[PDB]
Design a protein around this ligand. Structure first.
Ligand code: GTP
Ligand code: GDP
Ligand code: MG
Ligand code: MG
Lengths: 155, 424, 423
């Protein structure tokens, strides 16, 4: 399966061998087992050139997986500021929700990616968005002792 | 699936048997010395089926038959070892052929059968010619069949059995012998061509206008039918190629494997056929009950399966049209619950004498008429218990007759059941 | 890269000859194996002496057909260990092909496949050629497919089945054999292209202008359409470049994996436009399986053009048919027509009744109307099994009678599976 080799590459980060596999017509939106496209995997492990290659060949920027995770979720979780702005520029879902009720703003706030938090907010993030337990991004800064984040959330 | 071993047993067995070898030796271009003087490759393409010299074994308790064969035209070609003959005759006693005298010799026969099969690349099966009203052809033949069936159970058993009729011999024990023999064939053979002397006489008498038919006259009709039905086996061809494939497409129920053969056109002994028939004419010799080698009316029953063999140069397009025609224009006579049950095949080499010919092998439920005749004659004889001391003296039990009587009647009922069956 | 072809029964073997004859002309390979001239080595291997050998196995339970291969025009092309023959055939009996006779040679056959797979580095899967009504074609194939799903389970397997037709039918029991193999080979096949011998007969009588076609006539026509499907694998095209892509594009349901193939143009040897040939792909007369797609819903649709084709002409002909005909799709489909092109011209055989055409197209479409073909087999099957006709032959060769019913239920369930998708 050529859609499975393109996931192997986009994950481990062999920039050159993506172009090889894609020139062989590999499925840009090929799902693995839990529904993760190559754009998901590259946006998780920080391979910026592989993200922009897949997006311009037609990668579902707002593709979800078995747990409702968009690539912007995973980029905002791990903290890849370079990739976050690339996805948003390609029409990413700034207020996407996943199976646990989190938005990308929730994940960037939990992991302390203050520089990414400000990017999401300026792209119209839902500051008052709630999760399953009922907590906003502002509640996380209150609960987690981060006053640098509380100030960045009320800006 | 290549070689076929042939056997002939009893007087009739060796008569129509030798006649068969005369016919197909010519058709394949073999002389009585055993040398090829033909002029075509389609002839030696599948000569390995019946020849090596014929792969033929000659059997009879009557030792005289030995010379009646060797003093015949192609009598020189048969292997001397393959002659296996007894001292005395059976004298129309099925028990003598099946239990006493025929049993003592049957071992010697199996020894030669083994020898011929031993040197076969890939055996297909066996082929027996014999009469059913006799003592040797019926009693020892059916005993030979069972003895081979158990020594060669992975092979086909194909018999050319001729039915007795009062019109050819006034011996009244023939209903006994034939009934006992039918009780064997329904259990022991994969396919059996039913040659009815009743029908051979009625054809030589009424259609060929011969006031007194001889054996030779009836034997001419037989040998010509045999080469016709064995045309597929002896020449290259797609359909019904080997013995097993034939039986697979002809016999839907194991006990109902008694074919009603018939072929066209009906010629006399060495007469001249002025105008070669047309394809629609040949085709209209199927339902024509005056062409059936068994004395049965296809109109009175239904066809389960049909195999047609057209020999000669003719239009494959026209044959297909005429066969597809005659099927649906008589759609009530072919069973509906077996789709595409009629199968046609063509062979470019015609039979010698005729420009075109057509043989019509059919599993018709009308064949129950034939078994009715034998059973009524058997029962009339058996209810008065005539000539039973012959058979019982040779070790047979009176019960056997009742079982064969009942077993043949069950065979008749089965044919009647599928005749009245419906697809709905 | 590589792909192994297997040919079972006279149908498989004799269609194989027609295809490898046509493959060697398309690749300029000589009958002796040489080449005065990669993408094509998906199908062929190479000797140290510059000789190109097919990656193929031929199987028949009886010599005659394969004997003509090793004494024919292409006797030097195959290694003698690739051509395998038994002695006793299956006699139009699935049981003998599968149980009695097939078990005597299955191990030798699987062993000779390993020798070709050991020569290969990144083996893709298997192409399988066989009849339906044949005893060998039905029984032995279904057995071999079971064992290949073990010894090579993690790879693809594609079928090329010969759907039976009374006009060339050799057996009464061909409905039985078809149902029986389709039951046991359903789980083990990823995709399967049916070929109705009636359509190939109809086509040869109308467009090739032949009164009574022979097997060579039908096989040559078949080999052309098979070549059109495998062209993407042999020349490195854009569409369907490997065996997985066939399932991706054409199979949105593991069970319903039976595409309808339509091929145009079929020109007698005694030029058309891109638009004209694409309209003929939606004409039932040029289908390989006799049915009416207008009575069914499309699950997918690919177009494989080859020859003098301008990519813009294709898009016009697509828009024409997408606007001027009403091709109904299912709602859960991309409903967009996939396309691929290979600029090499369709090769014909020197002497063939088929003429060299400038361009050609082969439309592969998984329509639900192909269920009509299954309905015709099931009906014939039902009539004979209602009286248990011919069943004793099968039961007497190692087969349980229940297997008949278990197969029929799997065919009835498949007819419901086609219905529910198209409503
Ligand atoms: N299109 C096409 N069909 C064929 C060809 N050969 C046989 N068939 C069809 O296949 C069906 C079964 O015949 P075979 O394939 O020869 O049977 P087999 O596979 O050799 O099996 P056995 O002979 O019983 O051992 C028949 O209905 C034929 O119409 C062929 O060369 N081309
Ligand atoms: N068609 C035909 N039937 C025969 C011939 N000879 C005998 N019969 C029939 O066979 C029966 C007699 O059996 P027969 O073969 O002579 O006895 P056997 O020598 O013990 O086998 C009678 O019904 C005869 O009509 C023959 O040459 N041709
Ligand atoms: Mg005698
Ligand atoms: Mg065969």
């Amino acid at each position: 399966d050529l859609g499975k080799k393109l996931l192997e590459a986009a994950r481990a980060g062999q920039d050159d061998e993506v172009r090889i596999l894609m020139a062989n017509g590999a499925d840009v939106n090929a799902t693995d087992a839990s529904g993760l496209t190559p754009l998901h995997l590259a946006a998780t492990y920080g391979h910026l050139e592989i993200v922009e290659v897949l997006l311009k060949h037609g990668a579902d920027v707002n593709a979800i997986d078995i747990m409702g995770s968009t690539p912007l979720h995973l980029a905002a979780l791990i903290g890849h500021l370079e990739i976050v702005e690339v996805l948003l520029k390609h029409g990413a879902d700034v207020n996407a929700v996943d199976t646990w009720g989190d938005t990308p703003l929730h994940l960037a706030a939990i992991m302390g990616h203050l520089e990414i938090v400000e990017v999401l907010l300026k792209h119209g993030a839902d500051v008052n968005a709630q999760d399953k337990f009922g907590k906003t991004a502002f509640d996380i800064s209150i609960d987690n002792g981060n006053e640098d984040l509380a100030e960045i959330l009320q800006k | 699936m290549r070689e076929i071993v042939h056997i002939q047993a009893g007087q009739c067995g060796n008569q129509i048997g030798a006649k068969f070898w005369e016919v197909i030796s010519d058709e394949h271009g073999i002389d009585p010395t055993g040398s090829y003087h033909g002029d075509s490759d389609l002839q030696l393409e599948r000569i390995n089926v019946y020849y090596n010299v014929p792969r033929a074994i000659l059997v009879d308790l009557e030792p005289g038959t030995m010379d009646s064969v060797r003093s015949g035209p192609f009598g020189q070609i048969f292997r001397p070892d393959n002659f296996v003959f007894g001292q005395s005759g059976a004298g129309n006693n099925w028990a003598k052929g099946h239990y006493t005298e025929g049993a003592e010799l049957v071992d010697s026969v199996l020894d030669v059968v083994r020898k011929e099969s031993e040197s076969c690349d890939c055996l297909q099966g066996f082929q027996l010619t014999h009469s059913l009203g006799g003592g040797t052809g019926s009693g020892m033949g059916t005993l030979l069949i069972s003895k081979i069936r158990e020594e060669y159970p992975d092979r086909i058993m194909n018999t050319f059995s001729v039915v007795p009729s009062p019109k050819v011999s006034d011996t009244v024990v023939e209903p006994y012998n034939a009934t006992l023999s039918v009780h064997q064939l329904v259990e022991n053979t994969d396919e059996t061509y039913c040659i009815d002397n009743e029908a051979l006489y009625d054809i030589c008498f009424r259609t060929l206008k011969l006031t007194t038919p001889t054996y030779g006259d009836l034997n001419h009709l037989v040998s010509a039918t045999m080469s016709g039905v064995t045309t597929c086996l002896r020449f290259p061809g797609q359909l019904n190629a080997d013995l097993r494939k034939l039986a697979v497409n002809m016999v839907p129920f194991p006990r109902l494997h008694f074919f009603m053969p018939g072929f066209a056109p009906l010629t006399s002994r060495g007469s001249q056929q002025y105008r070669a028939l047309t394809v629609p004419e040949l085709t209209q010799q199927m339902f024509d009950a005056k062409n059936m080698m068994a004395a049965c009316d296809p109109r009175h029953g239904r066809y389960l399966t049909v195999a047609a063999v057209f020999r000669g140069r003719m239009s494959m397009k026209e044959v297909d049209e005429q066969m597809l025609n005659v099927q649906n224009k008589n759609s009530s006579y072919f069973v509906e619950w077996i789709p595409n049950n009629v199968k046609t095949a063509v062979c470019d080499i015609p039979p010698r004498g005729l420009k075109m010919s057509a043989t019509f092998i059919g599993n018709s439920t009308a064949i129950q008429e034939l078994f009715k005749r034998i059973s009524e004659q058997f029962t009339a004889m058996f209810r008065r218990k005539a000539f039973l001391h012959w058979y019982t003296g040779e070790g047979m039990d009176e019960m056997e007759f009742t079982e064969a009587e009942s077993n043949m009647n069950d065979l008749v009922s089965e044919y009647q059941q599928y005749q009245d069956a419906t697809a709905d | 890269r590589e792909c192994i072809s297997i040919h079972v029964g006279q149908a498989g073997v004799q269609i194989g000859n027609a295809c490898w004859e046509l493959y060697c002309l398309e690749h300029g390979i000589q009958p002796d194996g040489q080449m005065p001239s990669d993408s094509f080595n998906t199908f062929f291997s190479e000797t140290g002496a510059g000789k190109h050998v097919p990656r193929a196995v031929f199987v028949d339970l009886e010599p005659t057909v394969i004997d003509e291969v090793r004494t024919g025009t292409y006797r030097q092309l195959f290694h003698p260990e690739q051509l395998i023959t038994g002695k006793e055939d299956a006699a139009n009996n699935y049981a003998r092909g599968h149980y009695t006779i097939g078990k005597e040679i299955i191990d030798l056959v699987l062993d000779r496949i390993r020798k070709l797979a050991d020569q290969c580095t990144g083996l893709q899967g298997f192409s399988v050629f066989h009849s339906f009504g044949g005893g060998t074609g039905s029984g032995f194939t279904s057995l071999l497919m079971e064992r290949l799903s073990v010894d090579y389970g993690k790879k693809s397997k594609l079928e090329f089945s010969i759907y039976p037709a009374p006009q060339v039918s050799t057996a009464v029991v061909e409905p039985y054999n078809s149902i029986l193999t389709t039951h046991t080979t359903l789980e083990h096949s990823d995709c399967a292209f049916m070929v109705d011998n009636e359509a190939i007969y109809d086509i040869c009588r109308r467009n090739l202008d032949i009164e009574r076609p022979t097997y060579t006539n039908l096989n040559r026509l078949i080999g052309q359409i098979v070549s059109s499907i495998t062209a993407s694998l042999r020349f490195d095209g854009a569409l369907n470049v490997d065996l997985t892509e066939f399932q991706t594009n054409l199979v949105p349901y593991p069970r319903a994996h039976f595409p309808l193939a339509t091929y145009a143009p079929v020109i007698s040897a005694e030029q058309l436009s891109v638009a004209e040939i694409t309209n003929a792909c939606f004409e039932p007369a040029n289908q390989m399986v006799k049915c009416d797609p207008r009575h069914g819903k499309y699950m997918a649709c690919c177009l494989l053009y080859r020859g003098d084709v301008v990519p813009k002409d294709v898009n016009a002909a697509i828009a024409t048919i997408k606007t001027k005909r009403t091709i109904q799709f299912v709602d859960w489909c991309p409903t967009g027509f996939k396309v691929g092109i290979n600029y090499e011209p369709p090769t014909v055989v020197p002497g063939g009744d088929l003429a060299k055409v400038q361009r050609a197209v082969c439309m592969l479409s998984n329509t639900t109307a192909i269920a009509e073909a299954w309905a015709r087999l099931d009906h014939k099957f039902d009539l004979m099994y209602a009286k248990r006709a011919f069943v004793h032959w099968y039961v007497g060769e190692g087969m349980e009678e229940g297997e008949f019913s278990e197969a029929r239920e799997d065919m009835a369930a498949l007819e419901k599976d086609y219905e529910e998708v198209g409503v």
